[PDB]
Amino acid sequence: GCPPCASGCSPETGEFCWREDDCPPC
């Protein structure tokens, strides 16, 4: 499943691209 406020992205560098539905909104 997708990780919260990550969804495959590279968080902690200005990336908050979260996934909808299966993932909680960031």
- The residue length of the chain stands at 26
Encode 2-16: b = buried (16+ Cβ within 10 Å), e = exposed.
Answer: eeebbbebeeeeeee
Distance CA(21)–CA(18), nearest Å, equals: 10
The domains of the chain are located at: 1-26
Distance CA(7)–CA(21), nearest Å, equals: 12
Task: Give the start-end residues of each E strand in 1-26.
Answer: none
Return the SS3 of 22: coil
Distance CA(5)–CA(13), nearest Å, equals: 12
Dihedral sign of CA atoms 11, 14, 16, 17 in order: negative
Q: Give the list of residues 6+ apart from residue 2 with CB closer than 8 angstroms, or none.
A: 8, 18, 19, 22, 23
Do 19 and 11 touch, CB atoms closer than 8 A? no
Do 20 and 1 touch, CB atoms closer than 8 A? no
